[PDB]
Amino acid sequence: PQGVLSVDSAMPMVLHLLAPLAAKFNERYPHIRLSLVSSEGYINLIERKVDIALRAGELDDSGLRARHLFDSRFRVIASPEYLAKHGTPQSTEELAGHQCLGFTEPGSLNTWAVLDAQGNPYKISPHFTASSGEILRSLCLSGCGIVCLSDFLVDNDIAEGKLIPLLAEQTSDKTHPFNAVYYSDKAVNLRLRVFLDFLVEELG
Amino acid sequence: PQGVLSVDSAMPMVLHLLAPLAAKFNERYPHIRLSLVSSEGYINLIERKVDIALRAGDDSGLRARHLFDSRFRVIASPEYLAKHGTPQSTEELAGHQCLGFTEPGSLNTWAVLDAQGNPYKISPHFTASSGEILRSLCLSGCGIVCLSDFLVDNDIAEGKLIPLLAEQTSDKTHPFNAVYYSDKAVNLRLRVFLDFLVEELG
Ligand SMILES: [Cl-]
Numbered sequence: 001p002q003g004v005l006s007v008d009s010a011m012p013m014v015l016h017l018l019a020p021l022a023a024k025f026n027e028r029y030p031h032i033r034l035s036l037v038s039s040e041g042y043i044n045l046i047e048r049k050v051d052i053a054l055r056a057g058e059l060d061d062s063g064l065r066a067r068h069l070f071d072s073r074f075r076v077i078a079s080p081e082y083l084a085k086h087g088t089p090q091s092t093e094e095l096a097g098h099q100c101l102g103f104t105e106p107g108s109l110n111t112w113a114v115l116d117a118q119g120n121p122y123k124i125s126p127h128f129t130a131s132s133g134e135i136l137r138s139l140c141l142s143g144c145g146i147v148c149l150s151d152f153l154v155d156n157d158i159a160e161g162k163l164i165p166l167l168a169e170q171t172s173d174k175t176h177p178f179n180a181v182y183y184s185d186k187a188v189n190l191r192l193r194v195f196l197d198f199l200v201e202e203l204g
Numbered sequence: 205p206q207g208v209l210s211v212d213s214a215m216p217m218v219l220h221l222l223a224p225l226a227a228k229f230n231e232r233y234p235h236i237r238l239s240l241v242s243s244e245g246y247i248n249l250i251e252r253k254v255d256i257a258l259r260a261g262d263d264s265g266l267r268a269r270h271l272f273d274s275r276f277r278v279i280a281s282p283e284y285l286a287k288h289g290t291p292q293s294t295e296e297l298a299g300h301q302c303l304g305f306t307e308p309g310s311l312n313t314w315a316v317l318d319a320q321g322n323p324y325k326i327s328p329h330f331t332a333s334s335g336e337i338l339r340s341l342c343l344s345g346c347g348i349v350c351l352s353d354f355l356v357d358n359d360i361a362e363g364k365l366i367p368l369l370a371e372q373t374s375d376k377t378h379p380f381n382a383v384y385y386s387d388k389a390v391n392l393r394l395r396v397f398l399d400f401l402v403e404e405l406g
Pocket residue numbers: 010011012131132133134
């Protein structure tokens with residue numbers, strides 16, 4: 001396997017998942033020149049500007065191949081510093097009293113995976129907004145408020161004590177799948193298949 | 205000062221400079237609702253999708269306010285250097301794994317000078333769309349990178365990344381500015397944000 005393989009994903013996937021594994025992938029396949037780009041949505045992939053996309057969406061009836069990588073839950077988090085100055089929410093309805101940060105788009109992500117008293121996902125009014133989950137993580141780390149982000153983005157921060165998980169009982173246990181998406185015709189190339197195989201081992 | 209202010213910049217500027225200051229700004233001006241977005245180049249600003257752009261790079265009516273000057277640094281992780289040795293001259297970079305940008309290609313002309321005093325142009329083993337991606341690859345032991353001081357200085361402080369070829373690396377700095385259209389300067393929240401950024405960033 002040799003040559004250039006272009007892999008596209010959202011910033012958090014590239015930084016927390018791909019980048020860490022790229023050194024191990026390099027030792028096994030030193031002749032494959034990975035190109036790791038970060039863009040928004042499936043435009044690059046569909047317009048054939050990259051070979052493979054690693055994304056959480058569900059594209060069916062597109063014709064594109066999807067290979068499952070891993071499942072992730074959402075977590076509601078804040079910095080110890082924010083909680084020290086603002087208090088810790090003990091119910092989901094108390095989030096109305098706190099600074100909740102969200103996406104500029106898509107707005108569907110601003111309906112959090114934390115259930116209210118009636119068992120319905122809580123829609124926030126974002127104080128700060130951002131175009132990336134990675135920016136929301138940084139704002140949360142620096143004490144700007146409460147965010148709701150994928151586990152793989154914040155779990156190591158929680159382990160290091162840099163973020164504190166909130167409203168754990170109220171938080172939805174449901175997971176969302178992440179997939180490697182690509183056109184069937186590009187499965188022909190060995191370097192995509194060995195990258196895909198590698199990704200399913202290490203992420204699964 | 206009250207309402208939404210949208211700030212566009214490259215990822216490393218947002219994560220390493222803006223986000224850390226956003227809580228302090230919030231305490232001073234709690235009624236300003238920041239929107240921090242990251243994109244490529246000046247397209248959002250030009251097409252008036254954001255109020256201000258923080259970028260190092262002229263469709264006129266633009267104003268540019270200086271924020272700070274930054275040097276580049278060549279770095280690798282301690283784990284990489286233990287497995288591949290540390291380069292003692294710029295010319296030895298040919299034997300090592302150097303990671304670069306997909307684009308712009310001019311950025312793969314590094315700020316490290318060879319024996320003749322020429323900036324070293326690399327053949328990138330791996331490429332990426334963002335300097336933040338290059339920082340992560342570097343941290344993970346994938347190779348050597350050349351990135352702006354504010355992206356890696358703290359890692360160098362913490363001992364996670366090692367500065368290489370310190371004497372050969374250029375001392376020259378490049379400016380970073382807040383860029384915006386003249387007409388948007390009338391807005392109070394843009395003015396207090398700019399003032400804050402100028403005070404805080406140097
Ligand atoms: Cl994201």
